[PDB]
Amino acid sequence: GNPPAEVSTSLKVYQGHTLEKTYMGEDFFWAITPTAGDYILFKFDKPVNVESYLFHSGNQEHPGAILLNTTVDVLPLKSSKETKDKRLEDGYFRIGKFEYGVAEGIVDPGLNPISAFRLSVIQNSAVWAILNEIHIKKVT
């Protein structure tokens, strides 16, 4: 499973599809018409040495119900230059982005351990998106 975390979001829960249940692998999450400034937040119970991440949106039957113009940000516990240029003014590093509804990648190990993952919606969208896979892989 995923590292134990408190999860939260500015997107209103639709018909009991809680983000908690999605982070526990039980159900999907409806993200209805995301707006610029919306966020999805995963705050790990303890800092996590993260190897890689995978977020999937859309599904069979609803293949268009994907997250658009959303980034993947990580908040290191502590405060390469290539990764340095990805720093945002709030301390997060903007390391990933959704495309075709999928965001996947590696964490620069210089960032570890991570205290939070944040998905940031950058632009308005008319889609009723389905976030159906959240995978954060610990380092071994």
Residue numbers in the entry: 381 to 459, 465 to 525
Publication excerpt:
N-Acetylglucosaminyltransferase-IVa (GnT-IVa, also designated as MGAT4A) forms a β1-4 GlcNAc branch on the α1-3 mannose arm in N-glycans. Downregulation or loss of GnT-IVa causes diabetic phenotypes by dysregulating glucose transporter-2 in pancreatic β-cells. In this study, by combining bioinformatic, biochemical, NMR, molecular dynamics, and crystallographic analyses, we discovered that the GnT-IVa enzyme has a unique lectin domain at its C-terminus, which is critical for its enzymatic reaction. Comprehensive glycan binding assay using 157 glycans and solution NMR reveal that the GnT-IVa lectin domain selectively interacts with the product N-glycans having a β1-4 GlcNAc branch.
Because we could not obtain diffraction-quality crystals of the wild-type lectin domain despite repeated trials, we introduced an alanine mutation at D445, which corresponds to D877 in NagH and is supposed to directly interact with GlcNAc residue. The D445A mutant was successfully purified from bacterial cells and showed no retardation in gel filtration analysis, indicating that the aspartate at position 445 of GnT-IVa also plays a critical role in the sugar binding, as observed in NagH. We successfully obtained well-diffracted crystals of D445A mutant and determined the crystal structure in unliganded form at 1.95 Å resolution. The overall structure of GnT-IVa lectin domain adopts a β-sandwich fold composed of nine β-strands with three short α-helices. Six molecules exist in the asymmetric unit of this crystal. A DALI search revealed that the 3D structure of the GnT-IVa lectin domain shows high structural similarity to those of NagH [PDB code: 2W1U30,] and IFT25/27 complex [PDB code: 2YC431,]. As predicted from sequence analysis, the structural comparison with NagH GlcNAc-containing disaccharide (GlcNAcβ1-3GalNAc) complex demonstrated that amino acid residues that directly interact with the GlcNAc at the non-reducing end in NagH are completely conserved in the GnT-IVa lectin domain. Four residues (Y819, W836, D877, and W935) are completely conserved in GnT-IVa (Y394, W410, D445, and W513). The position of D445A is slightly buried and there is no water molecule corresponding to the hydroxyl group of GlcNAc around D445A. The activity of D445A was reduced to ~62% of that of the wild type, indicating that the glycan binding ability of the lectin domain is required for the efficient enzymatic process.
